[PDB]
Amino acid sequence: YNIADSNIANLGTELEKKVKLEASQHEDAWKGAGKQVGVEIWRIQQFKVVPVPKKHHGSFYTGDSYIVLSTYHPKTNPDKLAYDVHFWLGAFTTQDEAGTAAYKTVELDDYLGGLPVQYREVQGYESERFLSLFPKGGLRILDGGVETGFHHVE
Amino acid sequence: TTALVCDNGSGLVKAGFAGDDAPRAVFPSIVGRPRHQKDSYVGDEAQSKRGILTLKYPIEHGIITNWDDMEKIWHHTFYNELRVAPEEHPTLLTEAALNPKANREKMTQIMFETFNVPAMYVAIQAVLSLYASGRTTGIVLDSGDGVTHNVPIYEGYALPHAIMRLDLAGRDLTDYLMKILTERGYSFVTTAEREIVRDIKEKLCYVALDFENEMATAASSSSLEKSYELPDGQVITIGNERFRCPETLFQPSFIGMESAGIHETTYNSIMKCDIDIRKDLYANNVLSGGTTMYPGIADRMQKEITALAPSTMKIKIIAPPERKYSVWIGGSILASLSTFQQMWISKQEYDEAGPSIVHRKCF
Numbered sequence: 452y453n454i455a456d457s458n459i460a461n462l463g464t465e466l467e468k469k470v471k472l473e474a475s476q477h478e479d480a481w482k483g484a485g486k487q488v489g490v491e492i493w494r495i496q497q498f499k500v501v502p503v504p505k506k507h508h509g510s511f512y513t514g515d516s517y518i519v520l521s522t523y524h525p526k527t528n529p530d531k532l533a534y535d536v537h538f539w540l541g542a543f544t545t546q547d548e549a550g551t552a553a554y555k556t557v558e559l560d561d562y563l564g565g566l567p568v569q570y571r572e573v574q575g576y577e578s579e580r581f582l583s584l585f586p587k588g589g590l591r592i593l594d595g596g597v598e599t600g601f602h603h604v605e
Numbered sequence: 606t607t608a609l610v611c612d613n614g615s616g617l618v619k620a621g622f623a624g625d626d627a628p629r630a631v632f633p634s635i636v637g638r639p640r641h642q643k644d645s646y647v648g649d650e651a652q653s654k655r656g657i658l659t660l661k662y663p664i665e666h667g668i669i670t671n672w673d674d675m676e677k678i679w680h681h682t683f684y685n686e687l688r689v690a691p692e693e694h695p696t697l698l699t700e701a702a703l704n705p706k707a708n709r710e711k712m713t714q715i716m717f718e719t720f721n722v723p724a725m726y727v728a729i730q731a732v733l734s735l736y737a738s739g740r741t742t743g744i745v746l747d748s749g750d751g752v753t754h755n756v757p758i759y760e761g762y763a764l765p766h767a768i769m770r771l772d773l774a775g776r777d778l779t780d781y782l783m784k785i786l787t788e789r790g791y792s793f794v795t796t797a798e799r800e801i802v803r804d805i806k807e808k809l810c811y812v813a814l815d816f817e818n819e820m821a822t823a824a825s826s827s828s829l830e831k832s833y834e835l836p837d838g839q840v841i842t843i844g845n846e847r848f849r850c851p852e853t854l855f856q857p858s859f860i861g862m863e864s865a866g867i868h869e870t871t872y873n874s875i876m877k878c879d880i881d882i883r884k885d886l887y888a889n890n891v892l893s894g895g896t897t898m899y900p901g902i903a904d905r906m907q908k909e910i911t912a913l914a915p916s917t918m919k920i921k922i923i924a925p926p927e928r929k930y931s932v933w934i935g936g937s938i939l940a941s942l943s944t945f946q947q948m949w950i951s952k953q954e955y956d957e958a959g960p961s962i963v964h965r966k967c968f
């Protein structure tokens with residue numbers, strides 16, 4: 452095939468990155484994100500990105516999906532910031548929640564200039580990096596969750 | 606304001622509203638005209654009257670080849686199925702990767718100039734399926750009625766140099782089943798008869814785990830045979846055609862194509878990606894589309910990719926039960942997000958820039 456004659460000729464370009472960077476400017480949840488070392492968490496709630504209060508960080512509803520931004524100083528420079536972005540998928544989260552969490556993880560990555568490294572964290576399969584984010588006994592799974600944003604077609 | 610999501614497959618229209626968990630309209634992407642040469646029928650009703658019609662598909666191998674008939678399909682989707690006024694609804698369309706650029710240019714032109722939609726976007730099908738699976742990294746094998754293609758995606762970006770495409774999919778498999786059923790003395794020839802054989806294929810075919818062993822099993826006794834009742838009431842029997850037909854996906858030389866089979870194209874696509882992400886792709890093969898619904902296909906894919914890959918490679922085939930609708934569902938999710946809608950083409954932008962703007966907005 453001739454990529455250049457095709458509908459994927461503009462994938463992988465500066466233009467693609469520019470358009471997606473602009474789109475990420477229209478999400479209120481990212482404003483002020485990633486400005487200091489620490490952990491910031493949002494939950495998908497009927498397609499919206501909703502902050503989780505710091506007092507609840509580490510407690511996750513099994514029925515829900517989340518975005519967890521870990522901001523840290525890299526080895527290369529103690530005064531700069533680097534990022535791991537984890538999206539956490541509860542065992543009982545619905546398809547709309549997991550898909551929104553995945554898409555909005557990419558968007559937050561875009562917002563932060565591509566710098567975050569992405570991690571998909573399914574309940575019970577969490578990475579060593581994810582387990583390391585929370586103090587001893589800090590990671591707790593809660594029963595239930597918020598309702599799906601999908602309308603069910605009968 | 607509710608966006609429309611329309612996944613125009615080569616064989617089926619899947620259409621509905623963003624935020625629904627399934628498409629509300631699913632019907633054949635066909636226009637029927639009198640077989641004897643009121644003017645035409647579309648979709649389900651063409652199928653219903655197929656006894657007196659010749660059926661034509663405006664999409665072939667994922668590409669619109671009859672634009673007048675595709676206009677009839679879209680008109681039917683909006684006004685007769687969904688019963689909406691398109692000028693009231695932002696519309697998300699879809700496309701297989703590696704289509705010629707003019708396909709989405711003309712999609713854009715018709716949506717704005719004929720249907721007066723307020724906004725639209727053309728999405729890459731395989732990317733929608735990946736998000737429907739809740740992933741940002743993986744390699745999607747999407748196979749519908751028209752195209753089989755492999756799209757590796759890393760951290761939300763498709764890797765265009767590694768995308769693979771085979772213009773061999775469900776319709777070719779139906780045609781091949783029609784052909785090999787002649788060996789039993791059955792004669793399926795007409796466009797209407799193609800639809801009967803398509804149904805036989807969907808109901809009775811499967812992918813053998815070991816093709817040569819299965820051919821031997823089929824010759825040793827009738828244990829694999831199945832019966833099928835034709836619309837006229839005649840009952841036919843089919844045997845090794847059940848698995849010879851989808852074997853073509855693994856052996857395209859069954860229909861005279863020199864191409865790599867779907868296991869080899871998947872492997873080749875992964876091998877075109879940077880080595881450090883290949884383990885993630887091998888552990889996240891996501892199947893998408895109706896031609897991935899054969900019983901046994903995931904197990905066969907697992908076996909064949911294991912034979913090609915490094916001996917310690919962890920390999921996983923993800924086969925969502927809803928994967929006939931994964932593309933549509935991914936579109937329903939993304940079209941429910943205001944930031945994704947921010948990227949859509951507005952009618953004013955189309956008025957000022959024309960069809961070329963689709964390449965600067967839709968990724």
Ligand SMILES: Nc1ncnc2c1ncn2[C@@H]1O[C@H](COP(=O)(O)OP(=O)(O)O)[C@@H](O)[C@H]1O
Binds near residue numbers: 897898900
């Ligand atoms: N259970 C099944 N087994 C094998 N093939 C199937 C099955 N269900 C549907 N198909 C085939 O999948 C194709 C339609 O699937 P779909 O993903 O809607 O395709 P498209 O998007 O090209 O219209 C047709 O070729 C159809 O015969």
Ligand SMILES: [Ca+2]
Binds near residue numbers: 515
């Ligand atoms: Ca939930």
Ligand SMILES: [Ca+2]
Binds near residue numbers: 565567
């Ligand atoms: Ca990144």
Ligand SMILES: [Mg+2]
Binds near residue numbers: 613614750894
């Ligand atoms: Mg399709």
